Amino acid sequence: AHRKPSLLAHPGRLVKSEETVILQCWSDVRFEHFLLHREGKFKDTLHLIGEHHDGVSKANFSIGPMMQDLAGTYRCYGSVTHSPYQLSAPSDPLDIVITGLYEKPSLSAQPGPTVLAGESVTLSCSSRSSYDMYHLSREGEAHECRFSAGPKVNGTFQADFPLGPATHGGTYRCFGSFRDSPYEWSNSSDPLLVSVI
């Protein structure tokens, strides 16, 4: 049990539909072998060899055009040839999410895109579609605040995400999602520009 390798996903963790994604999995420690894996129903693990280009030891595990069922919790391992080399400790889990699959919500103005400092800017997500849950990206350089929506409230389906006290601004994206399929997200809502004057 050497030491969990890397497993970083670029150019994104959050992959679009039908497209490219290279799950790189390196370790400072030499690793003749690498193995990827995922907790999604319809799983697999790849036995790829490992390229040592530069004094590290990578493995560029390429996924195909992101089709639905490839989305899920990836996590590689590493080791040394021939008979079962037992693999090292599991790396830090990756959540590969396939987007572009459903309608783009609407990053709601209300309150409002241009607030004054220290006020309460609380974003939200409207959609006629039944997105059991929602998601919110970037806050100066952020990631995700994936939360559950409100019921069939006279048309829409919202998920008010409050940021209340505001000290900066930035762009945001809302991603519609269904319950029974957590990595299978929708399309991106037009990016919203919060800022502070």
Side-chain angles (χ1 to χ4, degrees):
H2 299 74
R3 219 169 325 125
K4 70 168 181 73
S6 300
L7 177 76
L8 74 166
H10 29 57
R13 264 68 173 154
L14 185 70
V15 293
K16 270 207 191 80
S17 82
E18 327 191 277
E19 61 182 76
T20 70
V21 48
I22 303 87
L23 286 169
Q24 192 171 269
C25 159
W26 66 288
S27 157
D28 41 277
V29 190
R30 204 148 181 100
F31 262 144
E32 184 141 294
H33 287 303
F34 280 100
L35 288 292
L36 233 296
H37 177 265
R38 64 177 195 221
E39 50 254 87
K41 55 182 296 116
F42 296 158
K43 52 154 196 281
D44 201 52
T45 136
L46 287 55
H47 239 117
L48 164 50
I49 330 112
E51 310 103 51
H52 298 338
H53 47 252
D54 223 37
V56 271
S57 271
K58 302 182 189 69
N60 277 48
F61 283 105
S62 172
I63 288 177
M66 184 59 46
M67 163 190 59
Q68 280 235 326
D69 94 322
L70 306 195
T73 317
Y74 286 93
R75 159 157 42 40
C76 73
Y77 295 96
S79 275
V80 194
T81 220
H82 259 110
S83 254
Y85 28 70
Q86 324 292 333
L87 289 311
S88 67
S91 91
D92 275 12
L94 225 281
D95 250 38
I96 300 300
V97 154
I98 176 180
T99 67
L101 295 156
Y102 323 103
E103 293 175 0
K104 70 204 70 170
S106 298
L107 218 355
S108 320
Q110 208 65 191
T114 34
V115 294
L116 268 193
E119 268 176 1
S120 296
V121 199
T122 158
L123 323 181
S124 49
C125 297
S126 282
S127 307
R128 312 208 123 142
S129 312
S130 52
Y131 286 139
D132 305 327
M133 290 179 147
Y134 274 113
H135 305 252
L136 185 91
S137 172
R138 204 155 321 279
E139 296 159 36
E141 201 259 299
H143 316 282
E144 274 95 82
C145 282
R146 60 158 72 177
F147 204 53
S148 304
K152 212 156 58 196
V153 47
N154 212 56
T156 61
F157 260 116
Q158 307 174 217
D160 285 33
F161 303 99
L163 326 208
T167 293
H168 319 105
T171 292
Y172 293 71
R173 279 177 164 196
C174 197
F175 304 99
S177 171
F178 294 137
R179 160 165 306 280
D180 299 45
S181 304
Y183 307 124
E184 297 158 63
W185 290 17
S186 69
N187 272 295
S188 169
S189 58
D190 281 36
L192 180 158
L193 213 170
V194 72
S195 57
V196 168
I197 272 50

